[PDB]
Write a protein that binds this ligand. Structure first.
Ligand SMILES: CCC1=C(C)/C(=C/C2=NC(=C\c3[nH]c(/C=C4\NC(=O)[C@H](C)[C@H]4CC)c(C)c3CCC(=O)O)/C(CCC(=O)O)=C2C)NC1=O
Ligand SMILES: CCC1=C(C)/C(=C/C2=NC(=C\c3[nH]c(/C=C4\NC(=O)[C@H](C)[C@H]4CC)c(C)c3CCC(=O)O)/C(CCC(=O)O)=C2C)NC1=O
Ligand SMILES: CCC1=C(C)/C(=C/C2=NC(=C\c3[nH]c(/C=C4\NC(=O)[C@H](C)[C@H]4CC)c(C)c3CCC(=O)O)/C(CCC(=O)O)=C2C)NC1=O
Ligand SMILES: CCC1=C(C)/C(=C/C2=NC(=C\c3[nH]c(/C=C4\NC(=O)[C@H](C)[C@H]4CC)c(C)c3CCC(=O)O)/C(CCC(=O)O)=C2C)NC1=O
Ligand SMILES: CCC1=C(C)/C(=C/C2=NC(=C\c3[nH]c(/C=C4\NC(=O)[C@H](C)[C@H]4CC)c(C)c3CCC(=O)O)/C(CCC(=O)O)=C2C)NC1=O
Ligand SMILES: CCC1=C(C)/C(=C/C2=NC(=C\c3[nH]c(/C=C4\NC(=O)[C@H](C)[C@H]4CC)c(C)c3CCC(=O)O)/C(CCC(=O)O)=C2C)NC1=O
Ligand SMILES: CCC1=C(C)/C(=C/C2=NC(=C\c3[nH]c(/C=C4\NC(=O)[C@H](C)[C@H]4CC)c(C)c3CCC(=O)O)/C(CCC(=O)O)=C2C)NC1=O
Ligand SMILES: CCC1=C(C)/C(=C/C2=NC(=C\c3[nH]c(/C=C4\NC(=O)[C@H](C)[C@H]4CC)c(C)c3CCC(=O)O)/C(CCC(=O)O)=C2C)NC1=O
Lengths: 160, 161, 193, 65, 161, 160, 160, 161, 161, 160, 161
């Protein structure tokens, strides 16, 4: 969360927490209801978001669903949607955390190495999280869409 | 390094489920504690030097340690002692803010035991000094946050002993 | 007899470089959260090799030493020495330069300064005659000055030294250039007195 | 050839504000050629060598280190 | 290295005067534009590799410089070119956030001309690459954020030329 | 400032600005209006601050103006009020910048070496900034006095 | 090459060339005739190697030529065969030089970053060099196919 | 780094000759002046900070260089100026003890002009500061010890200019 | 740093052309001379110290430079001279093995003139020492291997002069 | 051997073995019979080689057998021939190894320091290995004499 | 050698562009300040010798530099000093009229530092003399004409230092 990051910052600088970041933790504390609402709406409509985003990705980039591509077949397309499920789950975790660090710890360290191993094109995954971002911000109200799009934007930035 | 939030997310992540209502219950528990956690943290950050000097004046000053023959005799050892106490108080404040003693097990009590055995530091005097610091900060910042600091100081003592 | 100030920009430029208050060093003092460690390893790469290492590596080349640092069976200082010892640094900074240039380049990467005086260059070129480049780097990192300024867990950084009178303008002329700015050695040697 | 050393080093020279538990007590792998210099360095620092292993070394071997 | 605030403070300090109304107006201008600067910096951090690869696809691809004999020929030279363009975009983002190009001539434009002239790097082709990067990011973030990005992109192209 | 500190702290770490640092910069950007109001309050009434603080200082510490002290005589007392004016100017700079790197990076690094080379008691200078803080926080509203007293607090803390 | 590598490896060690390295250079000097024969075999039949390897690649990995893939269209397929021609040329250079420092030092260092910036799946490039290796070692005698397949093996290994 | 003895030995060795009567007379001159050199070095070691602060009080105080815009303005610059003047007095004491200015151009005057020209340090103002330091220490230790201090102070001012 | 093979490949690559018949003929010339290069390199690695000490015994011994006042006078200067001559012989062996003098002006002749001019090293005496080293090693390895050693020895003497 | 050296080279460069050094190990494997023949003939006539080389050394350099010299007396001359036995033994080990590294590990690291301790003139030992080289290459056929003389040449090069 | 007009034309020509609105605004700024430049140049041409002799009477007179041993000692050195100060005032008038300091680094500051360092001329004392000349002429021609004179006087002092 923001509190662990402020604590490791005050630890490496070997001082107490500044009143600026105490005010940051307090503002995060008061904005908990808005982030709960955002993560609530995202956990509500995860299937519709995944279905529309996967069909938009397959319409945009057909190389993955082509023969010889990565996600070819029923189980491979289902595993592709499972990976999109994991990434939307980490998006909700980072949305409720107030920080991008659980998304970093769980699903951003070695995604290039492991997708080099599996053969998955990583830019296709960046396009998938782009479509998930466009659909989820299409669902939300514009201010909350900006908040969720910050974390989605961070994920596609760490992808490509 | 995990908060109450990061430990909740971690526990829901190992078993593999999404956020359930009981996780939201723990999260709202953390927030309604966290407001007064912030005010107590500001109070401790304001008065840390007086807290440490009252802790050593309570327990360590007129004993054999601050006297000759103890491990607190020289000015080198006294400065190291005050630095050790300041670090205990600072990491207790971090654990109070995070709502989780994982930082105390991660950064404080990692190899502190064996260097305290190897340098010959008395564990009992340190534990007395930490408990004196505990009720000093309890009388300073209040009752409920005094209990908050109390379980984290007790976590440091249990990892030390 | 106050007149209004002209030459404002020459009063802003007036200074030791502000980078010494705006470059932050790197203690590996937690060792238990992995983004902390990844940023420390990236800073070690960028500080020894002076650039981003990624366009010089066919694959992730130092995964053995990075994984050993992840367990902390090794320390950061031996990781720095192992970065100096293997073949990318030797094909980067030892091959296109003589011994009297790799002396000041290796002082610039590891000790974070220029050589002090003539006896330092004499003993370092003696090591570069008797033994390897890797033994020269091992003489640098296991020296006392490395452990006194940086220590075991800290990545070396750009030092701004005073008291050897040669040391500051040589360090500034060394660090002010980019890599492969020119082929010239910034000090050849010190003239005798 | 490589040693495993657990060693404790106290800073008798000056107090250091930052946390130095990793600097004071540590276990590291040390190459055999660097071990004489490193052991001499730990002597001069005042730190006491606590445990020497050489699990990697295969000692008593003339050929192959 | 100084933003608009630090340069205003440095001017008022080199004067020795207090902050008068013109300095207050300059800081009010920066504090009005700062939210737009923040949002443009987030949008540029989103699409670093896309802006770089679209700049190469506009200018440098399918020309003579990627053919044999060009300075962008080999894979080492291609990777170093992508690295240089990522540097230009990153430091233009920093100078956009600060609102002052002091970081550009402190840390990009310092020895860049002499480095490129010693290596044999074409300065006109990299100026065209930075101009296409500017055109792509101004298509990305809009009119006025694209303009306040393009002023520092033009600063980099002017110091390079 | 805040932006310099965030940029440098992300710069050593070889990463971009984290979103928590970004909302820190955003909150400082929004609070800049109140910072400029505190700066106009401190700037417009500098005469009364310096005069009343010098009066209360020489009332509190009369030995430095007695023969034998540093600030004895006409020009020495004028230089003493000039040094107090310097520190109030640095207080205004630190109020605007949102951090103490103007104050520390201009007039607090070698302050002990300078005032030891001049023969000046530094505790009496801390009392001068204490009286300046008393007059200045007696001049404002509550939160404005707290925000200015943070930087006054940093100056007196960096003295001793 | 071999001579460069031996000279550099003796050069860092501050010693002359050891006699074992010298008979290494001598054996490479004697085997240079067979190296030049393998190089003429690879050079003279480059048209059929590139054509048949592109055919077998697009048969094996049809998604990169399908709409949505990288090498879709006339000029994109021409650039794909040009990249395969580049890698066969580097194979010939590495065959003559007796070591992979031409291949690595020209076209294998930042290959991941370049093909990441172009949007190219690197596994399909490894399949392209695999089909080039199949056609090339189908074109020679046994030991000649082994000696050329060593460098083809290095290229596919340096891909993944 | 060589005193009068080592320079005499180096001249007789570069000749390859033995120590003749002129070298004996030079060494007798140094062995007569050495006790005065010792007593002046003790008297200068007594009053390092006083000589430095009187040199600043004579030359650099209340001028433009301690005002805003000057190079001695900030507390960092003031502390570095006191450090530089302490260096000049310490090395002038060393060159007085050795009786040879080889340490001055070996270890002070080596890169000092280029350092001061890169930083923006005024060389004339620091030459006047060293001259006032010379005047104060010649008032301190007397006529002839002040003269044999002032020859190395003039050496530092000549190499700086 | 490039041998005959790497320079031929670099010429054909800067052309962008394939290896034509002239490049094939150049590489055939190198692949015919390589065994002689190998045997001469082994014979020179046999007698490094003997060739160096015979070069000093031919040129530099019993002259003025080993007498007092000479630059080869002291034991430190003698050891550094033997070190410099061992460097010249070692790098001439490397340039003989590569068949290209690119290593000599990359790693010997880069800052050697300015180093020797700053130290006060006589360039003519060291050129005569390298010439005597060439004469001794050409007496050692024969006519044509001595000639292909002497071309790089003459390269070092020409770049030094 | 050559395999340990190629393995530590591929380890420090953190890659697999190149097909060039795989071909080097294969050529070493095929040349095993020739090196077995060389080491066989050397282990056959070691006494004759040592006797002729020791008498040639004592004829060339009489300082070691003179009174006041190192090898004076029956036991000292016998220990001199024992050291020549150790060096010819290491020559055979390096001849059968294909590399000079067992000669380095067993008898080349501290020979200057230990002979500085015993008082042995090291250049006399270099002359002794020179005479052993001349005699052993006088015994062998010229190609095998060149191979053994490479290792002998390396030993006298590391001596002086 | 170029005024504000020629530098604006040179920028627009190196661009290859026509004169846009920013160049028109720069030339309008110069054409508004030109009458003040003309009147200040006439007033400075009135009192050349008076400004020079008042600058010497402020700074250099009655100091050590006019005493024996100073570099302004003899009548030849005094006449050359008056000549140098007349040069500085004349070229500052020229740079004020042009509105561009290109004549100063073209024709004053070109080899002036190396000339003064070869002669032994103190640079700090002549910088103080130019500063007093600036103070006197700013007292002569007023506030803003004195400022636009002092910017080129500060240019001469910065290039000299
Ligand atoms: C929370 C962090 C996290 C990530 C990222 C993750 C990825 C992940 N992706 C997998 C497979 C996969 N993922 C894909 C996905 C793709 N290929 C395509 O064609 C699409 C473009 C792209 C979808 C965006 C495919 C096709 C597979 C199956 C690969 C195979 O079976 O060879 C698997 C193997 C099956 C399993 O054990 O569940 C894992 C672990 N797991 C994690 O725990
Ligand atoms: C962030 C967590 C952390 C802690 C806590 C830590 C402690 C720590 N305490 C130390 C010493 C010490 N700690 C004490 C402690 C005490 N004085 C007493 O006698 C009492 C029992 C207690 C005072 C409350 C003393 C006396 C020494 C110095 C003993 C010596 O080495 O001379 C040392 C050895 C280096 C030094 O001299 O400081 C470390 C590393 N390091 C860490 O990284
Ligand atoms: C032992 C031989 C030796 C000397 C002398 C030496 C000088 C030296 N003086 C310096 C700075 C300085 N030196 C001065 C001194 C002056 N400026 C003025 O205005 C006055 C006229 C003058 C003092 C009398 C100042 C103000 C600085 C700081 C510059 C800055 O921080 O920007 C620096 C810049 C780095 C640092 O401060 O720590 C060096 C290296 N270094 C050496 O190794
Ligand atoms: C590998 C390429 C390379 C070369 C060649 C090189 C040379 C080099 N030779 C040096 C000194 C020297 N070189 C000589 C050599 C000579 N003076 C004479 O009178 C003779 C004519 C001549 C020998 C034949 C001497 C005497 C010194 C020592 C100078 C001194 O100590 O003052 C130094 C001064 C620093 C030090 O001794 O260790 C360097 C850097 N450095 C390099 O990196
Ligand atoms: C952060 C400020 C900063 C910059 C900008 C910087 C640039 C820089 N670019 C370099 C090389 C390069 N830069 C380029 C770039 C180009 N050549 C072209 O043909 C294109 C027109 C253009 C790219 C758009 C290339 C191809 C090289 C490699 C030169 C070589 O390997 O020979 C090098 C040579 C050393 C190395 O590659 O790692 C430096 C130091 N260094 C810095 O510190
Ligand atoms: C902006 C940061 C900054 C500071 C602080 C600063 C201080 C400064 N204070 C000075 C003198 C002084 N400052 C004082 C001040 C005091 N003495 C007292 O007794 C009082 C406690 C106290 C003030 C309330 C006095 C008495 C002097 C004259 C010292 C002397 O004449 O020896 C001087 C020397 C003369 C001058 O050039 O002004 C400097 C440079 N300069 C700076 O650039
Ligand atoms: C000698 C070392 C070397 C290499 C490898 C190299 C590659 C290289 N490949 C390119 C494009 C390309 N290369 C490919 C190749 C492929 N895509 C596929 O799907 C297939 C798997 C594969 C080939 C079989 C494609 C499709 C492009 C065009 C990318 C685009 O247009 O965006 C380009 C950009 C355009 C150009 O200037 O040619 C370069 C520089 N350049 C070099 O100097
Ligand atoms: C050795 C060659 C030499 C000469 C001649 C010389 C003259 C000299 N005369 C000066 C002043 C002066 N000289 C005079 C002298 C006179 N006024 C009269 O009415 C009388 C007729 C006449 C003397 C009898 C006066 C009045 C001044 C002061 C001018 C002033 O204060 O403006 C000054 C400026 C102050 C100083 O540093 O002394 C110099 C340099 N300097 C030299 O190095």
């Amino acid at each position: 969360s923001i509190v662990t990051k402020s604590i490791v910052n005050a630890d490496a600088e070997a001082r107490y927490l500044s009143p600026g970041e105490l005010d940051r933790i307090k503002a995060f504390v008061t904005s908990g209801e808005s982030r709960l609402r955002i993560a609530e709406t995202l956990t509500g409509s995860r299937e519709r978001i995944i279905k529309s985003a996967g069909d938009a990705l397959f319409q945009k980039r057909p190389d993955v669903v082509s023969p010889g591509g990565n996600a070819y077949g029923e189980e491979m397309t289902a595993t592709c949607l499972r990976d999109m499920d994991y990434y939307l789950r980490l998006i909700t975790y980072g949305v409720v955390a107030g920080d991008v660090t659980p998304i970093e710890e769980i699903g951003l360290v070695g995604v290039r190495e492991m997708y080099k191993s599996l053969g998955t094109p990583v830019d296709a995954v960046a396009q998938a999280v782009r479509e998930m971002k466009a659909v989820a911000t299409g669902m939300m109200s514009g201010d909350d869409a900006a908040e969720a799009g910050a974390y989605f934007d961070y994920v596609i930035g760490a992808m490509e | 390094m995990q908060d109450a939030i990061t430990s909740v997310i971690n526990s829901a992540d190992v078993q593999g489920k999404y956020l359930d209502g009981s996780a939201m219950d723990k999260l709202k528990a953390y927030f309604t504690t966290g407001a007064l956690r912030v005010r107590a943290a500001s109070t401790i950050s304001a008065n840390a030097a007086a807290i440490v000097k009252e802790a050593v004046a309570k327990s360590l000053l007129y004993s054999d340690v601050t006297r000759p023959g103890g491990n607190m005799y020289t000015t080198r050892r006294y400065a190291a002692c005050i630095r050790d106490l300041d670090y205990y108080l600072r990491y207790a404040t971090y654990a109070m803010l995070a709502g989780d003693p994982s930082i105390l097990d991660e950064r404080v009590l990692n190899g502190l035991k064996e260097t305290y055995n190897s340098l010959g530091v008395p564990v009992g005097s340190t534990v007395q000094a930490i408990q004196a610091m505990k009720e000093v900060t309890a009388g300073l910042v209040g009752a409920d946050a005094g209990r908050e600091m109390g379980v984290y100081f007790d976590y440091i003592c249990s990892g030390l002993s | 007899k106050n007149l209004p100030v002209t030459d404002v920009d020459a009063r802003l430029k007036q200074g030791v470089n502000i980078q010494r208050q705006q470059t932050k060093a790197f203690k590996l003092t937690d060792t238990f959260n992995k983004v902390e460690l990844k940023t420390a390893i990236a800073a070690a790469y960028r500080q020894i090799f002076e650039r981003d290492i990624e366009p010089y590596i066919v694959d992730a080349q130092f995964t053995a030493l990075e994984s050993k640092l992840g367990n902390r069976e090794i320390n950061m200082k031996e990781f720095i020495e192992g970065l100096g010892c293997s073949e990318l640094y030797q094909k980067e900074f030892y091959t296109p330069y003589p011994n009297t240039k790799v002396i000041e380049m290796g002082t610039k990467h590891f000790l974070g300064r220029a050589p002090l005086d003539q006896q330092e260059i004499r003993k370092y070129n003696q090591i570069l005659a008797s033994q390897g480049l890797k033994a020269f780097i091992g003489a640098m990192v296991n020296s006392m000055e490395y452990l006194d300024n940086f220590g075991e867990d800290t990545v070396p950084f750009r030092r701004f030294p005073t008291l050897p009178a040669a040391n500051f303008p040589n360090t500034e002329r060394l660090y002010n250039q980019l890599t492969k700015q020119n082929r010239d050695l910034v000090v050849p040697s010190f003239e005798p007195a | 050839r490589m040693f495993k050393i657990t060693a404790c080093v106290p800073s008798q020279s000056r107090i250091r504000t930052q946390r130095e538990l990793q600097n004071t007590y540590f276990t590291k792998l040390v190459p055999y050629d660097n071990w004489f210099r490193e052991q001499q360095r730990i002597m001069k620092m005042g730190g006491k060598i606590v445990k020497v292993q050489l699990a990697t070394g295969k000692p008593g071997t003339n050929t192959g280190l």
